[PDB]
Amino acid sequence: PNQALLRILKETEFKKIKVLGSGAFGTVYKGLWIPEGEKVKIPVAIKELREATSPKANKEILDEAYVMASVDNPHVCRLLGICLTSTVQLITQLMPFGCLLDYVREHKDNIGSQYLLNWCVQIAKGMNYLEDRRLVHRDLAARNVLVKTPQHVKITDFGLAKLVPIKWMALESILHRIYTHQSDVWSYGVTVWELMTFGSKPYDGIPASEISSILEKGERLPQPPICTIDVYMIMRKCWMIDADSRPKFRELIIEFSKMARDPQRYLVIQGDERMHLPSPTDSNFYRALMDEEDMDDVVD
Ligand SMILES: *CCC(=O)N1Cc2nc(-c3cc(-c4cccc5ocnc45)c(F)cc3F)n(-c3ccncn3)c2C1
């Protein structure tokens, strides 16, 4: 655990200025950090966890925050800072574009196959990194994947489930609260389904109490109209009862990277020719402005 990877922040160094959105664990705010002895206002993203915390949990919360601060990958948001008072405040780099769930919703039937398949590759790369570090996310979902730029996505909220998303969870996690790299593969399947349906709610109308019975019967999420049978098959392999039969993240990186080379062969999108392949000019602008970090080349 590198203590230098986590900055302990005092309430006097930062201020929340705008609510960006709320969820089951906390509220996301646009904040401003005013460094000690400076005059600058640096935009930051703060998430405040809504459970009443005590200083007894502090050592354990801090041990978890040290792990979240250690994750170093282009496709995973690492925790930068934390503030422990009566509430828990998690500080990271502000990402204006928000989450990939809201992004695919707001760009419904306006996203090219090239983006969708590359996002699938990037999400699998970040998950594979977490698996290599022997870490289980426990809460992979399109709301937990953030947009850095339209060409660069990063998985967020790693570690805060540990310190429930029934419809994203593998059968063994619903039944026995067992969370492994292979139950993360199941959630990856559902996350992919959320992208391919432009933010559709999985099992809409179905009460969360009925999900495990529906899964036992063999019922799964319906094939999105834009996926060929090969994209659907990879998703269905993610939702198998036997965890060991599900694909590995390393195999998912390879499969979606092969698919990204022939985008029109794997996804059927209306107006996919018109859907702008990121021009070198726009990529340079996006990168110099808000994405200077190192990142693996996007599959063309
Ligand atoms: C569709 C939902 C949505 O728009 N967003 C959900 C969300 N959460 C965060 C976010 C996450 C974290 C966080 C928590 C745990 C580990 C982790 O490692 C680094 N950051 C992590 C925060 F600390 C703050 C936070 F706001 N955001 C968000 C929005 C903008 N910029 C950054 N994060 C969103 C968006």
Compact summary:
The protein is built from ten helices and eight strands. It is α+β, with helices and mostly antiparallel strands and 300 residues long.
Walk me through what this model shows.
It is found in: Cell membrane; Endoplasmic reticulum membrane; Golgi apparatus membrane; Nucleus membrane. It is a single chain. This protein has 300 residues and is of the alpha+beta class. It folds into two domains: 3-93, Phosphorylase Kinase, domain 1, CATH 3.30.200.20; 100-272, Transferase(Phosphotransferase), domain 1, CATH 1.10.510. 35% of the residues lie in helices and 15% in strands. It is built from ten helices and eight strands. It has helices spanning 58-70, 100-106, 113-132, 171-176, 181-196, 211-216, 229-238, 249-261, 263-266, 280-290; strands at residues 7-8, 14-22, 26-33, 42-49, 81-84, 88-93, 145-149, 152-155. A six-stranded mixed beta sheet has the order 1-5-6-4-3-2, covered by helices on one side. Strands 7-8 form a two-stranded antiparallel sheet. A hairpin with a 2-residue loop joins β7 (145-149) and β8 (152-155). The longest helix is centred in the middle third of the chain and has 20 residues, at 113-132. The radius of gyration is 20 Å and the shape is globular. 38% of the residues are buried. It binds the ligand *CCC(=O)N1Cc2nc(-c3cc(-c4cccc5ocnc45)c(F)cc3F)n(-c3ccncn3)c2C1. The ligand *CCC(=O)N1Cc2nc(-c3cc(-c4cccc5ocnc45)c(F)cc3F)n(-c3ccncn3)c2C1 binds next to β2, β4, β6 and α2.
